[PDB]
Amino acid sequence: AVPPSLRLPVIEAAFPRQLHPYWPKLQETTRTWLLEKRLMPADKVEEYADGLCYTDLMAGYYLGAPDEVLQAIADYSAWFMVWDDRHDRDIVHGRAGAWRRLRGLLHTALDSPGDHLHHEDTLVAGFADSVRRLYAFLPATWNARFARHFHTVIEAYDREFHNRTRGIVPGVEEYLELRRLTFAHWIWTDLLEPSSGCELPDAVRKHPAYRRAALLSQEFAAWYNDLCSLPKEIAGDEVHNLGISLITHHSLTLEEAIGEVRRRVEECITEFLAVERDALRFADELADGTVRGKELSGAVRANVGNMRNWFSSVYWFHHESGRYMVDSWDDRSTPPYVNN
């Protein structure tokens, strides 16, 4: 059961959870990867990794993915969690130089991951290993789009570094634009395609129904994260959160901001339900009787189905993962799974 302040009855009633059959092997393989790439200390891997539920999150999202595709996605996603932790710790400890150098190496490794597989910085080497594997599934045109999207994500993280160092809370609209990048909306959307085995042509993925369904899936996920991660983020002096922007710039109380974020999250669901009908009609239209048409139709249908799965996976992840359980920590500002 979910606390009433975080409960979304429409998710529970209309978005039933799904789990990829590879999940049991995925859980252990990603844990071993985190250990072997030295992305987390061995004792913290053993104590916390399974409880963090990072593989559960992805195995509830990219249904139908080939096992090796899901493995690369899960490793990359766990890396992404550790990177968020490193970014936070660099801010907290004022390591502007270390952040800047890491930022530059990630930009370079993103374009040439093979060159960085054995880099002295284990965080860079881990990134490169996952990215090189992601680059082996689809044509180089997809790889170039992934890279373009992630260069933008890195710079959004750099903007967050500047905001927190300068004591700046973004305005609400500024935040919503930034959040599409710090949450990596377009990366998760890109990764639908290797999961269904097909790079979608620009004309297909830029169709308004596909774009809008993809957007709303990610807006829900990011703002639901904001709702559930607000306590940990307040305790950690994090400033990036829709609720924090509302409190700071619209002078809402903590209770008023929670209610406002909740209402915006709820609206994402029913806006998605409306556009999902249009997106599945588009999927039907692509089935024009040709082989390629059947392939594109099936791929769009699978991707839209996983856009829907993201709602339930993200919902339950926030209640299962130890990442957000600030009430259990000795130091509310320092999560125990983080390298401080």
Q: Which residues bind Mg ion (CB under 5 A)?
A: 84, 225, 229
Q: Give the shortest CB-229-to-Mg ion separation in angstroms.
A: 3
The verdict on 23 binding ligand BTM (CB under 6 A) reads no
Q: Give the shortest CB-94-to-Mg ion separation in angstroms.
A: 18
Among ligand BTM, Mg ion, none, partner that 125 touches (CB below 5 to 8 angstroms by kind): none
**Of 5 and 141, which CB lies nearer to ligand BTM in the complex structure?**
5
The verdict on 183 binding ligand BTM (CB under 6 A) reads yes
**Of 186 and 282, which CB lies nearer to ligand BTM in the complex structure?**
186
Which of 22, 66, 64, 84 lies closest to 307 in space, CA to CA?
A: 64
Structure tokens at 339: 């390298």
Q: Give the shortest CB-88-to-Mg ion separation in angstroms.
A: 6
Q: Give the shortest CB-81-to-ligand BTM separation in angstroms.
A: 5
**Of 57 and 246, which CB lies nearer to ligand BTM in the complex structure?**
57
What is the dihedral sign for C-alpha 15, 322, 182, 103? negative
Q: By CB under 6 A, what part of segment 40-59 binds ligand BTM?
A: 57
- Select from 77-85, 102-110, 116-124, 239-247 the region that touches ligand BTM (CB under 6 A): 77-85
Which of 22, 39, 63 lies closest to 303 in space, CA to CA?
A: 63
Which of 6, 114, 29, 22 lies closest to 61 in space, CA to CA?
A: 22
Among 55, 71, 225, 312, binds ligand BTM (CB under 6 A): 225
Is 142 in contact with 199 (CB distance < 8 Å)? yes
The verdict on 81 binding ligand BTM (CB under 6 A) reads yes
Q: Which position's Cβ is nearest Mg ion?
A: 229
Which of 95, 103, 122, 158 lies closest to 340 in space, CA to CA?
A: 95
How many residues bind ligand BTM (CB under 6 A)? The answer is 11
SS (H, E, C) 257-316: HHHHHHHHHHHHHHHHHHHHHHHHHHHHHHCCCCHHHHHHHHHHHHHHHHHHHHHHHHHH
Amino acid in the structure at residue 225: N
∠215-216-220 over CA atoms, to 5°?
120
Among 6, 80, 171, 273, binds ligand BTM (CB under 6 A): 80
d(CA 223, CA 183): 10
């209770």: which residue's tokens?
Answer: 255
**Of 207 and 323, which CB lies nearer to Mg ion in the complex structure?**
323
Q: By CB under 6 A, what part of segment 108-167 binds ligand BTM?
A: none
Among Mg ion, ligand BTM, none, partner that 317 touches (CB below 5 to 8 angstroms by kind): ligand BTM
- Select from 23-31, 73-81, 108-116, 272-280 the region that touches ligand BTM (CB under 6 A): 73-81
Q: By CB under 6 A, what part of segment 274-333 binds ligand BTM?
A: 314, 317
**Of 225 and 297, which CB lies nearer to Mg ion in the complex structure?**
225
Residue 311 to residues 18, 83, 190, 242, 265, Cα–Cα distance (Å): 11, 23, 17, 18, 10
Q: Which DSSP symbol is given to 338?
A: S
Angle between helices 208-235 and 242-250 (to 10 degrees): 70
Amino acid in the structure at residue 55: T
Please list, in sequence order, all residues whose beta carbon lies within 8 angstroms of the beta carbon of residue 46, skipping any fewer than 6 positions away: none
Q: Give the shortest CB-87-to-Mg ion separation in angstroms.
A: 7
The verdict on 267 binding ligand BTM (CB under 6 A) reads no
Helix, strand, or coil (residue 280): helix
Query: Which residues form the interface with ligand BTM (CB under 6 A)?
Result: 57, 77, 80-81, 84, 183-184, 221, 225, 314, 317
